[PDB]
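Action item from last week, closing it out:
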Amino acid sequence: GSHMKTKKQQYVTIKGTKNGLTLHLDDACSFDELLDGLQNMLSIEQYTDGKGQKISVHVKLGNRFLYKEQEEQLTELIASKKDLFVHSIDSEVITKKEAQQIREE
């Protein structure tokens, strides 16, 4: 029946039906395996909107520190033809460190 709802703290929503891919995750220190899964699935399935595919991946996680490089590598495939409205951004913490990738292992 009718029931008034208050505000939310941590919600998840993914829109990829007749449009591009608009998803918004609002959770910190939590896994987004149920988010990244659909993200890739929908992008491969169909991102054909018809008017203007909105491919805005807004991962408002926080101090979760997601591996952008993991998503970026797959994004590179679309970046070569980023004529659509694609915009992905998270909430990582900038770290000024010399992370030299040198492995003698």
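Closing note: The first strand starts at residue 12 and ends at 15.
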